[PDB]
Each structure stands twice: as C-alpha cells, then as structure tokens.
C-alpha cells in the first residue's frame with residue numbers, strides 16, 4: 237500500500253532493470269524521468285545523495301516526485317531495488333523458493349556485475365578491446381541452463397538485472413554507438429551473430445518477448461536516440477589498440 | 478542435512494565473508510584451503526570453473542574436498558553464497574525480515590562492491606592516490622546508522638560482506654603492505670585514526686568483537702603474513718607519485 241516512486245532515465249540500463257521487476261511484480265508505481273547527466277535537478281540529492289539513477293522512494297505521504305518527502309524511505313542501487321521488489325511482492329515469485337535455484341539467480345547477477353558489466357562500460361565508453369568482453373559474455377552464456385529458460389530456470393530478478401544491457405548491445409552495435417574501433421565493431425557484430433553465441437541470442441529473445449520488456453522499452457531506434465544524449469558517448473571519437 | 482564445503486584461503490577477504498556468515502548461521506561445514514594464486518590444484522576447476530576462491534559445494538555424497546563429486550551443486554561468488562546461507566538458515570535471521578531494512582543491507586553490500594572495493598584495489602595493488610579511497614570510505618561510513626549498530630541495524634550478511642576488507646586495512650597499513658608509498662600510508666593511518674572516521678572505527682570494532690570474526694581470523698600478524706604471499710601485493714615494492 238505504500239507508494240513506490242522510481243526516478244528513471246530512458247537511456248539508463250540500471251533504471252531499466254527496476255522497471256522490468258516492477259512490471260513483473262504487478263506493482264503500482266510512479267516513474268519520474270531525471271536528466272541526470274546533463275541537468276540534475278537541485279532536489280535530486282534528496283532522493284539519492286549519490287546523485288545516480290535509478291533512485292527509489294518508498295512510502296511517506298503522497299507527494300509530487302519533484303517535491304520528495306523526507307519521510308519516504310530512500311533506496312539506492314538497482315540490484316538492491318530488485319531484491320526489495322522481490323521482498324515486497326512474494327506472491328509474484330520474482331525469485332525461486334528453492335535455495336539452490338535462488339543461488340543460481342544471485343550467482344548470475346554477480347557474474348554479470350563483477351565480470352561483464354565493466355567490460356561493456358570500458359568497451360563502449362573507453363574503446364577498450366572487445367575480446368575480453370566477448371570472453372566474459374561467453375562465460376555468462378555458459379551459466380544459462382542449456383536447453384532454454386532463464387538464468388535460474390523460471391524467470392527471476394536475475395533476468396531483470398541482465399537483459400537491459402544485453403538488449404542494448406545489438407542495436408547499439410548496429411548504430412555504431414560507442415568509442416570502440418571499426419575493427420572491434422565488426423568483430424563484435426560477427427561474434428554476436430555466430431554460433432558461439434546462439435544461446436545468449438535465444439536468452440535475449442526470450443527476455444524481450446515478455447511484456448515486462450515491451451512495456452519498459454522505447455523501441456530500438458528510440459533507445460539509440462536516447463543513448464546518443466549520453467555525454468560519454470561522444471560522436472566522432474574512437475580509441476584504437 | 479546437505480553437506481557444505483567452502484574452499485578458502487586465509488588471505489582472501491572474499492572467502493572470509495562466507496566463513497563469517499557460516500559461523501553466524503551455526504552451520505555445519507567443512508573448509509578446505511586452496512593455494513589459488515600460486516599453485517592451483519588441477520581439480521579445482523571442477524568446483525569453480527572461474528578458478529576463484531571462495532568456491533562452495535552443496536550436497537552430493539560425502540567425499541574428500543580434493544575429490545569433489547560431480548553430483549554436488551557448485552556455487553560461485555561470495556555474495557551469492559551469503560544470500561544462500563541466509564536462505565538455508567532462516568531461523569538464524571541473517572537478514573532482517575522488514576523489506577526496507579533488508580534493502581539497507583543489500584544497498585550497503587552494493588555500495589561496497591561498486592564504489593569502495595575498486596578503490597582499495599587501486600591503492601593496494603597500483604599505489605594510486607589514497608584520497609578517492611578515503612572519500613569512498615566516508616561515503617560508506619555515511620550509510621551506517623550514525624548513533625550505532627550494524628549496516629541494517631541488527632547484524633546481517635551485509636556486515637559479513639564488508640568487515641573482511643575493513644579489518645585488513647589497519648594491520649596491512651601498519652605493516653606497510655601494498656603498493657602505496659610511505660607518504661600515503663602515513664596519510665591513510667592518520668585519516669583512519671581521526672575523528673572523521675570515528676564511526677567506521679566503531680563499526681570495525683563492533684564487527685570484530687563477534688565470535689564469527691574471532692573464529693575466522695588468524696590474528697593480525699598471521700593475516701599480514703598470509704597477505705605477503707599474495708603476488709599482487711608485491712611485498713617490498715612501492716610506487717611513488
């Protein structure tokens with residue numbers, strides 16, 4: 237019954253994670269866009285002192301999102317939000333009930349956060365080499381159940397954590413967004429279309445087919461355009477090794 | 478009833494996290510040391526193909542830890558193990574039951590993983606300037622309840638996640654172990670003793686005072702000696718400016 241407000245930005249895969257979980261939960265919630273990278277509102281540190289999106293408020297009196305209440309609980313960090321939503325909506329079964337299957341979900345989130353996410357960041361924003369990213373994606377792909385299904389079998393918050401990044405990769409590569417070289421762009425497009433990565437392509441299709449994805453995605457072209465607003469995705473700059 | 482085996486190493490704060498949680502759970506478990514950085518056994522990739530410590534097996538038939546069974550569940554990534562132990566031992570209350578307090582625990586773990594750990598790595602392994610690490614520690618300190626307590630109030634897995642790293646800082650600094658210069662060592666020791674960091678000193682004392690720490694710590698001197706076996710700590714080496 238307590239209000240949920242999610243401070244969002246279309247380009248932000250971290251915020252996307254939390255929109256997906258809130259859709260899967262059947263939650264009632266409000267979103268409020270924040271131009272966090274170009275023009276942060278002066279009140280935004282009241283909802284997240286770290287000055288990052290996503291930010292969440294929970295409970296407190298019903299107020300406009302640009303007039304946040306000191307009485308709402310302020311929740312930071314997208315993965316903590318995913319676990320919070322699973323805790324708030326247990327009947328939505330956003331995690332398995334079996335401990336080992338739950339661990340598969342947590343391990344998958346950690347594999348992504350610790351070994352893949354930084355490689356996406358460094359390849360796209362710094363133009364570091366693509367091979368370590370592809371190796372990390374092959375590792376992540378190896379953690380999926382072979383025959384189909386999601387990270388822990390049934391869909392869970394682990395798939396909300398990972399699909400925003402994987403789903404952006406394909407249209408961003410096709411639009412040439414990112415500071416990596418032409419050569420590495422070709423390499424990544426060929427690899428991600430190759431048999432080596434058939435399983436993760438299935439995984440991406442499977443997650444994208446769910447309403448929680450459709451209802452939280454602007455469309456491939458619209459997401460590309462939002463991404464071009466990110467300052468670190470400087471058009472015309474590339475790094476080479 | 479299902480067996481737990483933790484593959485560990487004394488120097489490793491990641492493994493330490495899981496020992497602390499297992500002690501707090503009152504779990505029955507085996508530990509088995511692995512010389513992962515200098516002489517990894519040929520069988521170790523059977524328990525963790527990532528070739529990292531900690532690794533955990535769960536269930537399967539009882540076998541010697543150097544003859545792991547293909548039948549046990551293989552669990553990777555320390556924070557996934559912490560959540561697993563909390564799931565296995567619900568009566569030990571290793572997380573709060575209140576969703577907002579649980580989220581404080583998850584957020585604190587994410588703050589550490591995302592903003593603090595990499596600064597510890599930069600300073601200790603590369604000898605980069607200490608100010609960004611002290612800034613990150615002040616941020617992490619800021620997330621604690623100011624008047625006392627653990628990260629989420631009552632002790633939780635969040636404090637298992639963080640104390641191994643903070644507890645190593647003071648004795649490693651006293652030994653001058655790490656790639657930072659004497660000048661930055663002095664600066665860090667002074668800062669960590671100053672009133673700026675009184676709250677995190679209280680937190681370290683409060684965590685260290687629990688049996689789960691005492692029973693999983695070799696002693697400061699002994700831990701320093703184990704850390705000197707770590708190749709990336711480059712005992713006797715320091716970078717300057």
Ligand SMILES: N[C@@H](CCC(=O)N[C@@H](CS)C(=O)NCC(=O)O)C(=O)O
Pocket residue numbers: 247248249250251272273287288289290312313314315591
């Ligand atoms: N670890 C954070 C990362 C969030 C993050 O980095 N958000 C970006 C937008 S995609 C941001 O707000 N950056 C602003 C800044 O770092 O100052 C999470 O998981 O929520």
Ligand SMILES: N[C@@H](CCC(=O)N[C@@H](CS)C(=O)NCC(=O)O)C(=O)O
Pocket residue numbers: 350488489490491492513514527528529530531553554555556
């Ligand atoms: N993300 C891992 C980090 C584990 C880790 O880095 N362990 C170190 C020892 S402190 C290791 O085994 N390193 C060997 C390697 O990276 O190849 C976790 O949370 O468990």
